[PDB]
Structures are given as structure tokens and as C-alpha cells.
Design a binder for these strands. Structure first.
Length: 242
DNA sequence: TTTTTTCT
DNA sequence: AGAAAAAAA
């Protein structure tokens, strides 16, 4: 139930989520690779743009993020929109809805240009303000899947370029889509948004850090590299969710 | 239609 | 408010 899941997630903690993010999560590995082949500001802008087109993919998320990172390493990027106009039509893992996705990037381009290194620092210290600002730039609801996901991925990119860690805010929920709906139905009859926010509050682990724990473990990523005590807690969570 | 969105 | 968006079933 909710109490048991919250207890195990609380034992894992932000510390354990941070371990998974930085050591196991393949999307973080892809971002780390790209961060070594392009300037810090362009890197963060590209990560947000990529997140906003990361819906209805033609591939797994891990394949898509690696395709993104390998494509942009060493490239000279000026317009984010023009870069994506060339990138998406040749991609393997993001072939659906390309004109629509390019239009999202053209629309967010101005906001992305405000992401100087200092503004990135400011937003990493106040990710709820970034959450609302991305939504306003697109003219959409901030609860939408790709807006929430862009904040999560911004948090990965910012921590790399700023070499410091700030936890995600408790108020930002897990992104909602057919995938978390299905996982929640495996576990409980409670509605997903209510369920996971309750889990986050009870455990003390913000929802976006819970998001980091869930998907690698559910996808079968190995936990063997976790130190023995954390490994035991991750094994216990696997018993609950998989 | 199924796999998130725009916009009329 | 929900049809259509592109690709894939």
C-alpha cells in the first residue's frame, strides 16, 4: 500500500535517488556525454528543447536520449529551432509529429535565449519558477507531461554544469501519462496524482526524485553497483513495483 | 485506433 | 472541447 511504499522510498531517501540518477540512469549518462562536447548554456537549452519534443516517441527513452546526445556532441549550434529542423527528420527514435514538435521549439526559442549561466543558477535554486516560466513560454498548463519532464531534465543538466545539487521541489508532481497510470493500477485503486503526492510527502522524497527511482528499476536496470545497504532497499522497492 | 500535443 | 497532428498497429 501507500504506507509501505513510502517507508521504503523514505529509507532510500534523496541520497538514494541521487545515486540512481548519477550512476544508473542512462539519460543522465547521455547528458554527461553531451556536456563534454558543447558549451554549458547551449547544453541546458538543448536539454529543455529535447524534453519538450520527448513525447509519442518511436523508441525507448534511453535510446532517444542517447541519439540526441550523440548527434549534438561537437556541433556548432546557433538557432535551436534550425538545429532541430535538421535533426528530427533524420532521427530514428523520434519520427512522429515532427512539424508539431518543431513548432514547439520555434515558440520556446526566445525563452531559451534567456538561459545565461546565471539565470540557470537562479532557476536551479528555484525550479518552481522555471516550471511556471516554461509553461507560460509555451502557453500551456504546467501540469502537462512534457513541461514537468523538462524541469526534471533541466535538474540533471544544471547539476552537471554547476557542479552542485539542489533537490527537486516537493510541489512538482510526477509527470502524468499512460505509463504511470498503468504502474499505479498495478499497485492500488487510488488515483495516481493523489497517490504519488501522498507517497512523496510521507517519505520526504520529492516526486521528481521518486520518478528517478521508478523507471530504471522497473526497466530492469541493475542495482548491483549500489552499496550493500542501499542495494537492499532498492531490492525491496523492486519487489513492490516489478 | 494507440502512442501527448496543438489549436480552431 | 476535442478533432487532427505522424507514424504504427
Amino acid at each position: 500500500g501507500s504506507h509501505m511504499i513510502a517507508r521504503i522510498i523514505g529509507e532510500i531517501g534523496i541520497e538514494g535517488a541521487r545515486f540512481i540518477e548519477e550512476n544508473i540512469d542512462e539519460q543522465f549518462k547521455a547528458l554527461r556525454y553531451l556536456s563534454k562536447g558543447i558549451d554549458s548554456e547551449t547544453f541546458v537549452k538543448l536539454v529543455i528543447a529535447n524534453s519538450l519534443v520527448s513525447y509519442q516517441l518511436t523508441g525507448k527513452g534511453e535510446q532517444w536520449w542517447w541519439e540526441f546526445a550523440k548527434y549534438f556532441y561537437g556541433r556548432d549550434v546557433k538557432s535551436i529551432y534550425l538545429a532541430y529542423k535538421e535533426f528530427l527528420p533524420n532521427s530514428r527514435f523520434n519520427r512522429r509529429l515532427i512539424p508539431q514538435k518543431l513548432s514547439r521549439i520555434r515558440r520556446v526559442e526566445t525563452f531559451l535565449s534567456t538561459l545565461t549561466e546565471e539565470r540557470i543558477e537562479e532557476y536551479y535554486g528555484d525550479m518552481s519558477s522555471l516550471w511556471g516560466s516554461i509553461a507560460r513560454a509555451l502557453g500551456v498548463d504546467k501540469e502537462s507531461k512534457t513541461v514537468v519532464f523538462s524541469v526534471k531534465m533541466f535538474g540533471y543538466a544544471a547539476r552537471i554544469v554547476l557542479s552542485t545539487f539542489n533537490p527537486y521541489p516537493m510541489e512538482i508532481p510526477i509527470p502524468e501519462d499512460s505509463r504511470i497510470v498503468k504502474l499505479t493500477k498495478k499497485l492500488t485503486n487510488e488515483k495516481p496524482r493523489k497517490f504519488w503526492m501522498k507517497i512523496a510527502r510521507e517519505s520526504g522524497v520529492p516526486p521528481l526524485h521518486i520518478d528517478s527511482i521508478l523507471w530504471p528499476l522497473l526497466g530492469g536496470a541493475s542495482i548491483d553497483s549500489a552499496p550493500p545497504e542501499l542495494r537492499d532497499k532498492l531490492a525491496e522497492l523492486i519487489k513492490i513495483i516489478r
